[PDB]
Amino acid sequence: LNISYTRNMTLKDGKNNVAIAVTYNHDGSYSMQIEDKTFQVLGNLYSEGDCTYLKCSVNGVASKAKLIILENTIYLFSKEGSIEIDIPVPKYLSSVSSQETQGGPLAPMTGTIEKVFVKAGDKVKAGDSLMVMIAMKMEHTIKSPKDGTVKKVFYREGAQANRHTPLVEFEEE
Amino acid sequence: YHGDSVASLGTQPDLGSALYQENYKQMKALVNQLHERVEHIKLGGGEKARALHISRGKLLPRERIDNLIDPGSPFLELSQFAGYQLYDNEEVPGGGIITGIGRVSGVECMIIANDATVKGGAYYPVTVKKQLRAQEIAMQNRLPCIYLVDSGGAYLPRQADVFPDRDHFGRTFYNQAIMSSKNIAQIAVVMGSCTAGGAYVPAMADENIIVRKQGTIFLAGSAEDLGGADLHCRKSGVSDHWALDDHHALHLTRKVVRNLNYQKKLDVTIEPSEEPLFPADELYGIVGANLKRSFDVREVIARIVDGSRFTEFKAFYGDTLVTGFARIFGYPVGIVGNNGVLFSESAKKGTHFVQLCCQRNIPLLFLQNITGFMVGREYEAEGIAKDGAKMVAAVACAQVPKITLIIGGSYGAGNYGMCGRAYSPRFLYIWPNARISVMGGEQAANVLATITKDQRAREGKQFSSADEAALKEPIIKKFEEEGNPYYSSARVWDDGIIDPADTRLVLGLSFSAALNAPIEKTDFGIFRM
Amino acid sequence: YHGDSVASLGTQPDLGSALYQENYKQMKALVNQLHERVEHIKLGGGEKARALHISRGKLLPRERIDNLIDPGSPFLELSQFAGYQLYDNEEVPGGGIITGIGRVSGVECMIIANDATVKGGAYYPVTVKKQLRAQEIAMQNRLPCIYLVDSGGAYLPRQADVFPDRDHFGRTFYNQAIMSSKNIAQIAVVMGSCTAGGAYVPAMADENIIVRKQGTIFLAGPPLVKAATGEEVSAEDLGGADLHCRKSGVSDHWALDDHHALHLTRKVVRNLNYQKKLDVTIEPSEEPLFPADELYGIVGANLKRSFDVREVIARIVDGSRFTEFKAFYGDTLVTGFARIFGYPVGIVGNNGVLFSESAKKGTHFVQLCCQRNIPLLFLQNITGFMVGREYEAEGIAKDGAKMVAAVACAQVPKITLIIGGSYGAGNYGMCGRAYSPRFLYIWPNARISVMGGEQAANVLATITKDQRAREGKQFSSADEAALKEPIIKKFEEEGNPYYSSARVWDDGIIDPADTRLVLGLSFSAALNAPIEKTDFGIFRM
Amino acid sequence: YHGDSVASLGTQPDLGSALYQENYKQMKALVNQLHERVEHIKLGGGEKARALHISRGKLLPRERIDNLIDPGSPFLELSQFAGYQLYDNEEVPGGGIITGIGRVSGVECMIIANDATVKGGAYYPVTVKKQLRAQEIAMQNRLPCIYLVDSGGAYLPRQADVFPDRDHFGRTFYNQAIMSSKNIAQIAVVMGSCTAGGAYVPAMADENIIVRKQGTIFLAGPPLVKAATGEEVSAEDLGGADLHCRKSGVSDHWALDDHHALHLTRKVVRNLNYQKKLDVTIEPSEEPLFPADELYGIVGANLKRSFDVREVIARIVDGSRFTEFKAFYGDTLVTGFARIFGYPVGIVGNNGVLFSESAKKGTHFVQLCCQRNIPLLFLQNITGFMVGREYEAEGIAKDGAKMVAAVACAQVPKITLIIGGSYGAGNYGMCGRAYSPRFLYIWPNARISVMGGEQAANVLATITKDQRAREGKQFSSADEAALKEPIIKKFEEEGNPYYSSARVWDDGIIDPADTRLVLGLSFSAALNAPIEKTDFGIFRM
Ligand SMILES: O=CCCCC[C@@H]1SC[C@@H]2NC(=O)N[C@@H]21
Ligand SMILES: O=CCCCC[C@@H]1SC[C@@H]2NC(=O)N[C@@H]21
Ligand SMILES: O=CCCCC[C@@H]1SC[C@@H]2NC(=O)N[C@@H]21
DSSP: OOSOOEEEEEEEETTEEEEEEEEEOTTSOEEEEETTEEEEEEEEEEEETTEEEEEEEETTEEEEEEEEEETTEEEEEETTEEEEEEOOOOTTTSOSSOOOSOOOOOOSSSEEEEEEOOOSSOBOOTTOEEEEEESSSOEEEEEOSSSSBEEEESOOTTOEEOTTOOOEEEOOO | OOOOOOOOOOOOOOTTSHHHHHHHHHHHHHHHHHHHHHHHHHTTTOHHHHHHHHHTTOOOHHHHHHHHSOTTOOOEEEOTTTTTTOSSSOOOGGGGEEEEEEEETTEEEEEEEEOTTSGGGOBOHHHHHHHHHHHHHHHHHTOOEEEEEOOOOBOGGGGGGTSSSTTSTHHHHHHHHHHHHTTOOEEEEEOSEEEGGGGHHHHHSSEEEEESSSOEEESOOOHHHHSHHHIIIIIIOOOSEEESSHHHHHHHHHHHHHTSOOOOOOOSOOOOOOOOSSOSTTHHHHHOSOSSSOOOHHHHHHTTSGGGOOEESSTTSSTTEEEEEEEETTEEEEEEEEOSSBOHHHHHHHHHHHHHHHHHTOOEEEEEOOOOBOOOHHHHHTTHHHHHHHHHHHHHHOOSOEEEEEOSEEEHHHHHHTOOGGGOOSEEEEOTTOEEESSOHHHHHHHHHHHHHHHHHHHSSOOOHHHHHHHHHHHHHHHHHHTSHHHHHHTTTSSOBOOGGGHHHHHHHHHHHHTTSOOOOOOOOOOOO | OOOOOOOOOOOOOOTTSHHHHHHHHHHHHHHHHHHHHHHHHHTTTOHHHHHHHHHTTOOOHHHHHHHHSOTTOOOEEEOTTTTTTOSSSOOOGGGGEEEEEEEETTEEEEEEEEOTTSGGGOBOHHHHHHHHHHHHHHHHHTOOEEEEEOOOOBOGGGGGGTSSSTTSTHHHHHHHHHHHHTTOOEEEEEOSEEOTTTTHHHHTSSEEEEETTTOEEOSSOHHHHHHHHOOOOOHHHHSSSHIIIIISOOOSEEESSHHHHHHHHHHHHHTSOOOOOOOSOOOOOOOOSSOSTTHHHHHOSOSSSOOOHHHHHHTTSGGGOOEESSTTSSTTEEEEEEEETTEEEEEEEEOSSOOHHHHHHHHHHHHHHHHHTOOEEEEEOOOOSSTTTSSOOHHHHHHHHHHHHHHHHOOSOEEEEEOSEEEHHHHHHTOOGGGOOSEEEEOTTOEEESSOHHHHHHHHHHHHHHHHHHHSSOOOHHHHHHHHHHHHHHHHHHTSHHHHHHTTTSSOBOOGGGHHHHHHHHHHHHTTSOOOOOOOOOOOO | OOOOOOOOOOOOOOTTSHHHHHHHHHHHHHHHHHHHHHHHHHTTTOHHHHHHHHHTTOOOHHHHHHHHSOTTOOOEEEOTTTTTTOSSSOOOGGGGEEEEEEEETTEEEEEEEEOTTSGGGOBOHHHHHHHHHHHHHHHHHTOOEEEEEOOOOBOGGGGGGTSSSTTSTHHHHHHHHHHHHTTOOEEEEEOSEEOTTTTHHHHTSSEEEEETTTOEEOSSOHHHHHHHHOOOOOHHHHSSSHIIIIISOOOSEEESSHHHHHHHHHHHHHTSOOOOOOOSOOOOOOOOSSOSTTHHHHHOSOSSSOOOHHHHHHTTSGGGOOEESSTTSSTTEEEEEEEETTEEEEEEEEOSSOOHHHHHHHHHHHHHHHHHTOOEEEEEOOOOSSTTTSSOOHHHHHHHHHHHHHHHHOOSOEEEEEOSEEEHHHHHHTOOGGGOOSEEEEOTTOEEESSOHHHHHHHHHHHHHHHHHHHSSOOOHHHHHHHHHHHHHHHHHHTSHHHHHHTTTSSOBOOGGGHHHHHHHHHHHHTTSOOOOOOOOOOOO
8 A cells, every 4th residue: 555565585596696676566567676777577377288388578578488496496498598596495494403414425326336445443534435336337436525433334345235325334423 | 147237337537627637636646645655654763773673683564564474465554644743753653563454374364563663662652542443453353463573662751641541551452362262363473572561462362473582571671581582482481482583483473374274254245356447547537635626426436346337226315325236346335425415315315225235234335525414494393313313323233344435524423424433434544635523624613703703793892804814714724734634544543544546456455354254133223213 | 058157357456556547647638638629529610600500490410310310319420530630721520521320210320411510511522531431331231321411512622532533422322322222221311402413312312301491402503504504593493492392303202391301201211111130149238347437547548558458358348258269379469259238249459569379369260250150349459669579570471461361351240449559560460441340449549550650760760870871971869860750750640549530540539438338339230231151262371 | 375385294214223123023013913813803703603694695794884885985993802802711703793984875974783693693791882882983973873783682691781780781772862863863774683672773763774584673582472471483473574564664674685785775874965064174185204104113112112202293194294382391292283184183292201381281282272173183102100200290280180171171073092101190181081082092002001010010019118117027029029020910911902902992903004094084084073162161270
């Protein structure tokens, strides 16, 4: 009533946070200000087959693109190109007490263990090779994530290790 | 079968006519004046206060509401002009409190947020009245109440007008207790300091949320140790939910409302909505700002009802009053509007119409543009007072939702018959050109010009024409100043001053909110035949 | 079987003690001051106005009430001090209106009579508030309303405080319409001129009586007809005419004079087909075992000294019999069951600073009374500026609300009597004006405000001592009383009983010796309405 | 708007951990033991009895239910273990009666079928209790009752425990009459002999179906007629005759065989003119985010070890979404809102020893659910013999009662699931059998008794150590286990889930992997009745 609603939105392009001030106009259009530049934006959503399409006009320039919003990423597909924009995730929703002191680099894939370079108790530094695994004839060398001493080893040479299974246990510090 | 073709109201105004050009220009200036004043009120305490508020990590009060309500949903703010020039040297934008109706998790709720940037959130006498009005609206319509609490306590220099009386600060907790007993959810969000009576608000709420460090609760006033989220959340137990920051608390509030297990049910029949057949901005030219000129109220109706369709009741009887059935955004409505001086026939026609709407449970809308009652020896002999009372008595007892819109003058007993503030309409709005007082400014001047002309003619000292305006000019100035819409709205006599182009939208939002409560059966008193 | 012997409250005070002598002397002076001020208010406008009123053949407003009520019946007048020094240079004795409860034809009714000798019966802002309070009392207790209408219209210089708002003059007609719809009889007697906008009062009434020559009812006065249509009409011809009685039909009964109209009113009430029914058990009445005037010595006028509220109870309840509930728990609050004039009552009275235990004890007691449909009486004496007032209140806030919430939802009749201080949130917990007690009375020694005068002074003496200690310019002790003395004066003036009663915050200032009688009359009137079931909100455990 | 993203409960357990491996192995063995025992109960009387039953052209009792309910619909059987080892030398699989809830013609109904292969369908004391429990469930949820009657009368050797008392066989007809008066349809199908006193069941029903050759209904059997009047009559001639169908009129429908009778029953239910209406809000269903079988490893069979009840919740609620209420206050109790198959539910589960804060937190939560008409689910895991169990309980007693009193008065549907121990007053506060939960289920690892076995042993080890220390004859450590070992054995035997379920204390022992399905079916059935307003007693603050 008697004023215009302006919404402060934040979007992440790569590592850069972009602040967008969106004003809801009476006619149904939107006035967006990014930094010192203002844009007049109007558009709508229409469906072709199973794909949702965004028809928009920015400062009088009209374009069409395929819109997909999965998880926190906005995918825009246009014949000019494809752009991904990340929606910031509120801290509260992000698991508080996020996982910490992760020890085991996980097998890149299901493959035979060809070499083990670490004993049950061994002091290792970041970048110290722990194990070598061959998967579909492709050699991967597992490397030490931390400088912590090794608490235990979950696999021995010749064992087949499934994808994303812990390979080494590191002593709690 | 709803395929019948029907007639529609409204006519195309003469845009070239000088009267239309003048009326549009005058009304436009009033609307522009209204808009820019709200812009200033939007800023609250000011840049220094706002900068200090943000420096503490807290959101601005209006940003809190924006994040609380559903994305893109309209927000119906109430009494934006409370406290406007009310106090001699103190500026209190919006009364220090922001109240309105918005949608949270798909549910219409009443939101009451203290503006900490205005006098540190202290409660002025108008602040209490504005909050009490909001609570009254929530109870009458069964709207859940959300309190964004950030307050500094009562304003001691004016304590006598805040603490003691029935409609003083104490009534706020009484309303919370009553609504809770009726299953009208009371949710409090402590986003700041609350002291003395303020601490009772979170305690009296059904569910309560407090921010980690900003929020503080204590009967007697470090603040964090005495109060604080941790103490109440973990030790005192006063806190039901613990929030990291303002954004987290608002997210929690939306979750709380979603668990109310409430679903809206409509008692009225619904039909598809249709836009009016005429532009709303034409109301500027049609109405203007000169109350002495008269316009056809049907023109106003034609530009707010669905499809400009209107079924007039008793069109040729008591023509100074217009009554009929229409629909706004699909809801059925019975409209009563003034089209001249009230007569005995007009009052009888209104009384008959109000009974019809109450019988069918149809909401009522009143359009007040009054100029008084018919004055004459014959009319009194025929019981005009008896007829006028018939309408005051029917309007009072009606239990259907009632909304009043003052589009012109509102004087004397005509105000009561047209559902004034004293008759508990669910909402009351006024246009920027309205005037309200016990009587018109001129009538009070002329009446006094009879009493003292008599005073000196009968006494015998002559009283000249120049002595007349030393009598009349101060009276006219007083009534003009006290009848101004801003004077009426600064105090909470109405729920806001609205742009005429926004009339249809405001009515649609208001009626939608009023339908959250079931419509009760109407019991009338004795009709003095 | 009711033959059991029981213990009784009260002890004999030491009449020889200096404290008792001083307390009696101070309280007596206050009562004498109260009496003589009422005597002046009794005279209304004055000798010249009264002589003019009688010269027109009309009865004086208080003589009308005397003739209306049953012979010898007591009359409970309300808000005698409304408008006392309220307006700077205008004296408005009693607000220009007399309201009270009396018995007409054996039925308790609310009587609202305009005092035509005061400003010609014009409606001042306080006049509207006093009338609205009377209507609220009548509706809550289902008391028929009798309007002795003799008014001169609204006071134009203060129109903004009379006309527009919800609790302004318009609400008067709204209340009449609502009560009529509930079968609460509305009777109007036009015993004098009814001005513009007052003509509605006769019309909105269920039954109406108008005096032959004196009464005039017109929506537009002869002057407005003269201004609007250029027509000159006598007041009798325009309204209150034989035209109103016969041609217009607004009048239901026609009366020769004031005496005849009052006789007709008594007949109208007798035809209401109403009979009072009691929802509560009744026991024979008994006088208290101690004289009431001893309350002067016991209580005194010094709020800093403390007294045992049980002494006050012992001198107002039947036989001084009292069953205390949770006597040893939360001892700062006293709760128990008693009887006044045979009616059962649950009494809640302050005996010190409120604690968490006291609030819990009160909340438990209020639930008991609501369950059994027992009327509640509150005796407010809140304590201020004590070392106890200077205490951690975090627990007090958590537990007090429970009492504010129980008291608000209680549906049993509630009567509040302020026998001492009434400060802060303690007022709310003890059923303040905001919590709709059926009646609220105050003793002449009471004080009410947001906080005690001293606390406001001391609090400010911390804020500005800090202001200049933290800022660095020193702020001396003499600078302290240039801060404290104006504050203490303001709170003393605005907390005075007359200040509170001049505005309608209470229903009257009563002599302590009259406490038992006033309570008996009030509870008797409140029992005219059936007691409803109480629905509570969520108790925050 | 329901598009908000929210947090979800649950964590991935360490499958490699030794504790998880051991817990899974132990719980799996219990589930396998439960499954194979039910398989044996499934066979009823045995091969010889089953062969004889089929030789008469009658369907087996469980085949009758399969044909009665809608094709492919789930069937919720109740009290499968009633009578398990209850009687010393007599095996009574399932108590001789099969009861459960299934869908007939799209309507949820309670089905009560006698198992004629078990002791010829005679009524043992447990048989009466099982039937009475089924009728209680049907009445509380307004479920139509279908009686597949094939019975041999009361078991005379135990008549004193069947006939006389209020909860004895007579109550069965009382329940039928009461449900009929409430418009809860009572349908009886006589598919076999109806003995003396069972002839009432067809008669007391609203609509009745009898099989042509097999069915016989007679108040007095051919032997009693022969003894009383010296008359010899065939069973078909005396009752269940074409005489009963036509001449006597006791039969409303005539059926050729068992298949025909079941077809007729479905038609009868379709004509009830009933449509289910929901009082609660509904949201789309979602599966939990974690596998249910992980509950084996998480919970195990060792009651001394403790687990986080939130893990159990995360694996049964829609989407593993849970809004916790008062998370950090009284942390030994977990309360919050969730949804199961779209229905809203308030969950109360134990997470340790009950404290004063926990009881207060529970009491507050129960009021919230009752106000909003939200069904309540209780997860009982009470803790016993801990240093915490050895604590001052004076506060616990004062505050616990508040929860016992709120839980009792709650009128929302209540379902209780015992996932661990259930001892002492903790059982009452968590909606035990005595507090009329709509359903009560137990996991195969549960234990229930007045107190934990160890506590009773230790308590006695204090009383007699005292007995001989105070008396003066020494009482040695070996004398201690001649005291403790018999007590521990008794409590272990009587607290076993099968002991509790053999008698009807619960409605069945359920596999943890089936917890979500059983709760979904139970809550769906409980919603057939409208939710009433809750009236509370006095909350002792
Ligand atoms: O074994 C799978 C195919 C690719 C690896 C085979 C190696 S390539 C070197 C050597 N020479 C052969 O012909 N085979 C093995
Ligand atoms: O405005 C000045 C006094 C004469 C005109 C006022 C008119 S008369 C008809 C109508 N009714 C009133 O009470 N006032 C206006
Ligand atoms: O008492 C011994 C058996 C035969 C006599 C019993 C009589 S027959 C009439 C009455 N009805 C019964 O069921 N028993 C008795």
